[PDB]
Structure 1
Amino acid sequence: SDQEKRKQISVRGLAGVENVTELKKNFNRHLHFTLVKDRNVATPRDYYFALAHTVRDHLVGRWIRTQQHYYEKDPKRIYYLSLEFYMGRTLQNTMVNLALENACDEATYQLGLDMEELEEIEEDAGLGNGGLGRLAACFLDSMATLGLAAYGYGIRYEFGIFNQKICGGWQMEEADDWLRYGNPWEKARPEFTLPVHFYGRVEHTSQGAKWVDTQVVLAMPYDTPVPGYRNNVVNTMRLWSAKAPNGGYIQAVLDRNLAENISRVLYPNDNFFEGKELRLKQEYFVVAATLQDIIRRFKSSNFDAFPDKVAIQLNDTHPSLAIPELMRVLVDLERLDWDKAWEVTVKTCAYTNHTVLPEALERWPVHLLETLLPRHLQIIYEINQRFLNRVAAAFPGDVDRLRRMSLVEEGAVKRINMAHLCIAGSHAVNGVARIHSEILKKTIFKDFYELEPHKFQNKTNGITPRRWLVLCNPGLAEIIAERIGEEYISDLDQLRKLLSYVDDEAFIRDVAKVKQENKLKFAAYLEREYKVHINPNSLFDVQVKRIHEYKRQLLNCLHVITLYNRIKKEPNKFVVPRTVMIGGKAAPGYHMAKMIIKLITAIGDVVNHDPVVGDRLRVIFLENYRVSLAEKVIPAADLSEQISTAGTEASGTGNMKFMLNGALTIGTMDGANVEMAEEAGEENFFIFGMRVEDVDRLDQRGYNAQEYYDRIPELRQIIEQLSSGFFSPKQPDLFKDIVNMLMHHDRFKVFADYEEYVKCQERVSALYKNPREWTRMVIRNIATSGKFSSDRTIAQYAREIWGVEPSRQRLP
């Protein structure tokens, strides 16, 4: 009795068995009881929510069963700490991974509703800037699919990356109010709310140190379910929200906004460090709450065993304060000896590096750290002293090495090198692509690689075949399925078997048919939503990624102006029609990035209206590039632009998405491009330009852009056009900053790769002229894209860093 009567309360029976009748029944229940509406007043958005709640209900039993499972079994837990999780939309993904897509599609059909229309109502959960943010998302999906006891931990931003609008040809930022109509996926957990401390001071009492007189900010966690692919595993992504703890009364209540501002906006910087105190607060905020929750879970089914039960993966140095914080907790609060604590910390943390550009790495001024986090600075100084002691003993006499390896950067404004803090406090440091990891070992982290070689590894990036194939390209996924089955969805290497079809006329016809369907669908979408007309029988040339000088959208710009100038030169000469699409967001304070967007639209303004050009060349800027737009444009792409200066793009992931969806690649030997070319065969790739060794040689003697300008007539013509106002009649000097940079301050040597890039593009169009051969080369690409699935990347992280074994065994 009594407590035995509570056994009734169980998940036991849900919405049935996963079919049309019960689904309709539940959609209906949600529309009336959850949305408090009826068919006469229900809005399209209401229907979207009704469907989303019905689908979400199917996650619950699994979600509860999975967490119960980890509690019972008690496996080692993996914690992915990141300040970004670029999740995109959740509805379709959930349906696909739960195998409910068809049933929901039919149930919504019988209720007279269009599921595709409804899916379009959901907006992106854009809590990320780009690559690094999307990687965390793909990683969450793969860890679930591989049955790992993994937890994603981040910040629940009220405003994700800004929604970009184009006005007058310029980018305009708009707050991304994604939580306006609520979020049907998350579930707040008040009872796990935790306190995070700031400022204050340190007093050294008999016992040890004490952090006193601090300002408190509460951290309320919101859980979002992350379903693996058809294995009945539902993992959790826990995002923290800032809440005030509990000039006059009114102002005091209005001032609660100050403390809650911590989780207000995602800083829109991609590959760029901005030392704003509010960002430092966000970083400490996610770290402090996360570590408390991790230790709680550890204590609930001493610390010697911590590393055998916990793995903390730092996505970049953003959550690096986890190192000194874990030490603070173990030493100050748990009272362990420093060295035993340090052993535990190193064994627990591992650091992932995503870039080699100096301006993209974190170096916090010590004055900012001493006032905001006084005891963390003290602990960092002690970590530094003991680390420097070790290198000094390993390399006696080498004082300059000590200076280079120090966690503290002396100078006008003393700063703390966070990357150095991470290497010292992690048992594994990793690059995200073979070439990148090697560059780390030879340049920026060389001193560290020499002191601790065992620490450095590589983990080439990947993307999830679920969202990036099954989800976004059903057509491609089905034709691949009719030939080889469905086991590839969680074993991408099986795509290899498609090589056996390279000379199969049916498959060759099908690959091309799927592509043109996608091209047609994308063209329809652009005309409907933006009233933009694009020629579907043109080659879709696409460069989508954040706007950057290192990504060289400018090089792409030089090429399209070349294509235009050549056409005007010889109007009646045939050219492979092209629709050149460039999309991506610029960071608010990045002037050159904003000028590049303006140059792109400016070029289009001339190119797109020249009668002699007509249907032959069209240049368009894809506004507001985000995960959901990627899922639309990537599958309709013919040519994938991956032209960063060799040695600058650590890996890239968009490159992999384009390859998986049937596009041929034109790029440099940079990042993962190297490994992708290796996988498909350089003969099936369009690699061009300088190699890393080539830019290094140019650096040794000095890069003189004038040389290339004096030697290339076609290049001179374009700069002359830019400078004279040909692309900006009403404001002739509009692009003088672009021209000046290119001519005298180009760190990314655009002119040095111009000629080879233009020639390589000539060969791309030569191949496109032969559909049969273009398609056969495409098949050889898709068939070798298997190594780039995040399931592979994750399995390596698991076996070589976390010390846990992946698994595709389903739960009941």
Structure 2
Amino acid sequence: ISVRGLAGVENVTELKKNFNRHLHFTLVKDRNVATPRDYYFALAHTVRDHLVGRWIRTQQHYYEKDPKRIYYLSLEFYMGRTLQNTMVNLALENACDEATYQLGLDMEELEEIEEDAGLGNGGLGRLAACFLDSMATLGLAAYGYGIRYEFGIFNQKICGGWQMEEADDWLRYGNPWEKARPEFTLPVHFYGRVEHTSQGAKWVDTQVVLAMPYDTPVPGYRNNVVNTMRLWSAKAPNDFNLKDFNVGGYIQAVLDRNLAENISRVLYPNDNFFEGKELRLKQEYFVVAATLQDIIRRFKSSKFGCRDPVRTNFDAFPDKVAIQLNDTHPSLAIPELMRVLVDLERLDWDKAWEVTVKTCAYTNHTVIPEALERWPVHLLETLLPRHLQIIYEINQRFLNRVAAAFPGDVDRLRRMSLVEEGAVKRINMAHLCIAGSHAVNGVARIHSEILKKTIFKDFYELEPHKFQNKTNGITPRRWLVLCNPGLAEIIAERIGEEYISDLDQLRKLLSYVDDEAFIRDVAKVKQENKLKFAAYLEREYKVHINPNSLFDVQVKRIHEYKRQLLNCLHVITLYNRIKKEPNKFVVPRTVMIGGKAAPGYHMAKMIIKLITAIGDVVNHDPVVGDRLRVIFLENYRVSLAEKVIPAADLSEQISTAGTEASGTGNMKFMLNGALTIGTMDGANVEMAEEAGEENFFIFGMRVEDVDRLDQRGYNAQEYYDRIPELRQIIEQLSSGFFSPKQPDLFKDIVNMLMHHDRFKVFADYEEYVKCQERVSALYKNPREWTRMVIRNIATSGKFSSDRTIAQYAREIWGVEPSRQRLPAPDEKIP
């Protein structure tokens, strides 16, 4: 059937009886009233049963061996479905496929029933999920720490071509993969005031919120390791949230509990954009405060909570603990670690600070200013008064270091300050993270250089040893074996299975680039993937597409910097050239654009409407026929990404040079047989450097040309004046050619493009359509298109998150990865 494992005689029988055990005892149902959702839950429990033994022994193992622990703090974990991924890393896929077949069920139909764990917005959240998978596969004692939102990223709906947002009640029917640990509840404080008494400060008169943890197992790939993702949930204390007496009403007091619990209620839907709301900051401190007490409690047990030098010596703290900050969201970990170490444990400032800097590391994910976290001082002052004092003291000592290092440079002083003066004073969280971490990294070579050369130049001059690079990566398990079993099979038929946990081996596929059988195969799985997606489109969304055309797809969050608009202009150009010469031959294309817009992002929502508007005209022009279809992919999420990517021919990564830190969708496409048309931005540079530029479709300005244009001054009118085809499009948008009933509907987009285009869309237009003509020419030659594809796939090995994690571990955390199988799952009950 494929190498989804073995379908052993005894195991398929065992799986079947356990499926039935659960349908009966767990779901309280009988085959006569069980719905597909019941069957999915019976399977979920049956599979989940296989990792409880491993989970207990892994955790038990880390306790006995006591290695250095890695803690990944992120306010986002974009996990997706988890049934298939668990079967994959456990080698249960074929067994479970057989077992359900015999029970008369379709396993694929059942997997579609599982809800996505959408606790993330996009790139940042998915990276943490991939990292988790890699850290388990590499045998690292790691824990993911975050928040358990009952409502994740909103479900996107298209109404009249407009995006509509609807609550993501993903827990509605239950989450079989989480394990509530009520017995580990912790208290988090808010507000209050600071009292300075004899032997130290005291944070007093605080409001308490309880933090209840829910653990989700994270299984390593076929190595019997199961790590833990701990997500906190807000719970109201039953005392004060009722006990603070003297009228108000008893009923009201109970109802008002949903005020303390609103903290873990919903995820903020912003991607690469900062919104300074109090509720956000509360979530940020909530995850930080609970996680730290948990980390310190675990440390106090270790082997110190037995003997060792005897005396709670936090000197060894950094030898046993490493906490990674995914962006600046969990940045309050720095001042909170100081609060505990100094205010509670009573360490002297300097020892506390040495410890903090040595255990904390920070990862930067973007350079656009509107994404930077600058919290108003009055907010931190009301909510976390003690933390504000600590930040001031950290700032004081840091600026003293600066003044010493660069005497008289008064401007460098104000530029480097953690406290920004002006309208309202604010705290620059990124500056805080640099000062309190022993390492700061970019997510791609180009982005990391931009950090040192631009944004954090002053810091790089002060402490150069701190800045590193860690190019992102994706996990080959979910992004190859799970979503593209076909391509994974034909690759394994030739080079083995060892590449699944050592992607570098894909390079061996290079020697099959001239193999007639392989070329036919690689091409065959892509055709099968395209046919299946084409089917899915009519099944769940309904309105046909031609599977023989080139599948042009750009899927990611909708942003001005990602330039979905530039893709739009190319689509209109194609349409116009067809209408001009109808009986001329052109390579058929199905351009698919998908992604969610943040609810408050007006321009982004206007772009979605443009895209659907364009498809309304194009898809109904009889002269166009089936040569050009413009389709907007609804509700783009992880599970949907697993469907499109394997079916794509052209991956669109056209952000303005210097704006996309790294990108990860680009890597997903490269590994699944799509060719890439993009700019020299983020990881794109390293990808084309790995495949060779001849095997990539690069175009547009490079970082340097963008800066040259900025010195000169960007004027859109020039491009509009010199390019007739461009002018025609803009006049088509202005006159209402795409919005008849509302002729001025897109005046906002045209205005922006012409007068305030921060991402110089027009500047890259000519080179973009010229380059698109080249891919169309290569597509016309199936054999040569496929061979280039093989060059990309065979050369994507470097973008596996296992490589990224091995680097973080070795160069930042100080731990050695290991591909050693943990001692079987075998029963055991001590």
TM-score by length of 1: 0.98
2: distance between equivalents of 1:561 and 1:34?
55
Residues 15 and 259 (structure 1 numbering): CA distance in 2 closer, same or farther, change over 3 Å? farther
**8 Å contact kept, 2:364–2:442:** yes
C-alpha deviation, 1:140, in angstroms: 0.2
RMSD: 2.7
2: distance between equivalents of 1:468 and 1:648?
25
Residues 209 and 145 (structure 1 numbering): CA distance in 2 closer, same or farther, change over 3 Å? same
Residues 452 and 514 (structure 1 numbering): CA distance in 2 closer, same or farther, change over 3 Å? same
Residue-by-residue CA offset, 1:622-659 (whole Å, 9 max, x unaligned) = 00000000000000000000000000000000000000
Residue-by-residue CA offset, 1:125-171 (whole Å, 9 max, x unaligned) = 00000000000000000000000000000000000000000000000
Residue-by-residue CA offset, 1:704-726 (whole Å, 9 max, x unaligned) = 00000000000000000000000
2: distance between equivalents of 1:551 and 1:14?
43
C-alpha deviation, 1:49, in angstroms: 0.3
SS of equivalent to 2:156: strand
Residues 340 and 602 (structure 1 numbering): CA distance in 2 closer, same or farther, change over 3 Å? same
C-alpha deviation, 1:532, in angstroms: 2.7
Q: How does 1:636-647 map to 2 (within 5 A)?
A: 636-647=647-658
Residues 557 and 715 (structure 1 numbering): CA distance in 2 closer, same or farther, change over 3 Å? same
Residue-by-residue CA offset, 1:743-772 (whole Å, 9 max, x unaligned) = 000000000000000000000000000000
Residue-by-residue CA offset, 1:552-581 (whole Å, 9 max, x unaligned) = 000000000000000000001100000000
Residue of structure 2 equivalent to 1:108: 100
1: distance between equivalents of 2:282 and 2:7?
43
**8 Å contact kept, 2:5–2:94:** no
**8 Å contact kept, 2:416–2:431:** yes
**8 Å contact kept, 2:6–2:91:** no
C-alpha deviation, 1:99, in angstroms: 0.2
C-alpha deviation, 1:123, in angstroms: 1.0
Residues 561 and 311 (structure 1 numbering): CA distance in 2 closer, same or farther, change over 3 Å? same
Residue-by-residue CA offset, 1:670-696 (whole Å, 9 max, x unaligned) = 000000000000000000000000000
Residue-by-residue CA offset, 1:152-194 (whole Å, 9 max, x unaligned) = 0000000000000000000000000000000000000011110
**8 Å contact kept, 1:432–1:458:** yes
**8 Å contact kept, 2:6–2:94:** no
Residues 462 and 14 (structure 1 numbering): CA distance in 2 closer, same or farther, change over 3 Å? closer
2: distance between equivalents of 1:572 and 1:777?
30
Residue-by-residue CA offset, 1:510-556 (whole Å, 9 max, x unaligned) = 00000000000000001000003111000000000000000000000
SS of equivalent to 1:547: coil
Residue-by-residue CA offset, 1:427-482 (whole Å, 9 max, x unaligned) = 00000000000000000000000000000000000000000000000000000010
Residue-by-residue CA offset, 1:284-316 (whole Å, 9 max, x unaligned) = 000000000000000011100000000000000
C-alpha deviation, 1:603, in angstroms: 0.1
2:616 corresponds to which of 601, 605, 619: 605
**8 Å contact kept, 1:557–1:600:** yes
**8 Å contact kept, 2:5–2:92:** no
2: distance between equivalents of 1:13 and 1:469?
15
1: distance between equivalents of 2:819 and 2:5?
25
Residues 494 and 358 (structure 1 numbering): CA distance in 2 closer, same or farther, change over 3 Å? same
C-alpha deviation, 1:19, in angstroms: 1.2
**8 Å contact kept, 2:188–2:209:** yes
C-alpha deviation, 1:231, in angstroms: 0.3
Residues 568 and 12 (structure 1 numbering): CA distance in 2 closer, same or farther, change over 3 Å? closer
SS of equivalent to 1:157: coil
**8 Å contact kept, 2:678–2:697:** yes
**8 Å contact kept, 2:75–2:146:** yes
C-alpha deviation, 1:15, in angstroms: 15
Residue-by-residue CA offset, 1:195-247 (whole Å, 9 max, x unaligned) = 000000000010110000000000000000000100000000000000001x2
**8 Å contact kept, 1:31–1:37:** yes
C-alpha deviation, 1:489, in angstroms: 0.1
**8 Å contact kept, 1:357–1:648:** yes
**8 Å contact kept, 1:195–1:216:** yes
User: Runs in 1 of length 4+ with deviation above 3 angstroms?
Assistant: 9-18
2: distance between equivalents of 1:304 and 1:35?
51
1: distance between equivalents of 2:748 and 2:6?
63
**8 Å contact kept, 1:62–1:233:** yes
**8 Å contact kept, 1:580–1:618:** yes
**8 Å contact kept, 2:7–2:95:** no
Residue of structure 1 equivalent to 2:60: 68
**8 Å contact kept, 1:18–1:103:** no
C-alpha deviation, 1:11, in angstroms: 29
Residue of structure 2 equivalent to 1:402: 413
Residues 585 and 664 (structure 1 numbering): CA distance in 2 closer, same or farther, change over 3 Å? same
Residues 543 and 15 (structure 1 numbering): CA distance in 2 closer, same or farther, change over 3 Å? closer
2: distance between equivalents of 1:590 and 1:279?
18
2: distance between equivalents of 1:29 and 1:144?
30
**8 Å contact kept, 1:468–1:657:** yes
C-alpha deviation, 1:248, in angstroms: 0.2
Structure 2 residue runs of 5 or longer lacking an equivalent are 238-247, 303-312, 823-829
**8 Å contact kept, 2:3–2:489:** no
Residues 11 and 81 (structure 1 numbering): CA distance in 2 closer, same or farther, change over 3 Å? farther
SS of equivalent to 2:10: coil
Residue of structure 2 equivalent to 1:208: 200
Structure 1 residue runs of 5 or longer lacking an equivalent are 1-8
**8 Å contact kept, 2:342–2:349:** yes
**8 Å contact kept, 2:215–2:228:** yes
* Residue 270 (str. 1) matches residue 271 (str. 2): yes
C-alpha deviation, 1:17, in angstroms: 10
Residues 18 and 230 (structure 1 numbering): CA distance in 2 closer, same or farther, change over 3 Å? farther
2: distance between equivalents of 1:686 and 1:140?
32
Residue of structure 2 equivalent to 1:217: 209
1: distance between equivalents of 2:25 and 2:402?
66
Residues 16 and 643 (structure 1 numbering): CA distance in 2 closer, same or farther, change over 3 Å? closer
Residue of structure 2 equivalent to 1:286: 287
SS of equivalent to 1:165: strand
Residues 516 and 248 (structure 1 numbering): CA distance in 2 closer, same or farther, change over 3 Å? same
TM-score by length of 2: 0.96
C-alpha deviation, 1:253, in angstroms: 0.3
Residues 789 and 702 (structure 1 numbering): CA distance in 2 closer, same or farther, change over 3 Å? same
2: distance between equivalents of 1:396 and 1:329?
34
2: distance between equivalents of 1:427 and 1:17?
54
**8 Å contact kept, 1:11–1:61:** no
Residues 727 and 14 (structure 1 numbering): CA distance in 2 closer, same or farther, change over 3 Å? closer
**8 Å contact kept, 1:155–1:239:** yes
1: distance between equivalents of 2:647 and 2:659?
27
Residues 11 and 295 (structure 1 numbering): CA distance in 2 closer, same or farther, change over 3 Å? farther
**8 Å contact kept, 2:77–2:126:** yes
**8 Å contact kept, 2:646–2:673:** yes
Residue of structure 2 equivalent to 1:509: 520
SS of equivalent to 2:259: helix
2: distance between equivalents of 1:466 and 1:16?
22
1: distance between equivalents of 2:418 and 2:28?
57
Residues 379 and 10 (structure 1 numbering): CA distance in 2 closer, same or farther, change over 3 Å? farther
2: distance between equivalents of 1:655 and 1:419?
27
Residues 612 and 387 (structure 1 numbering): CA distance in 2 closer, same or farther, change over 3 Å? same
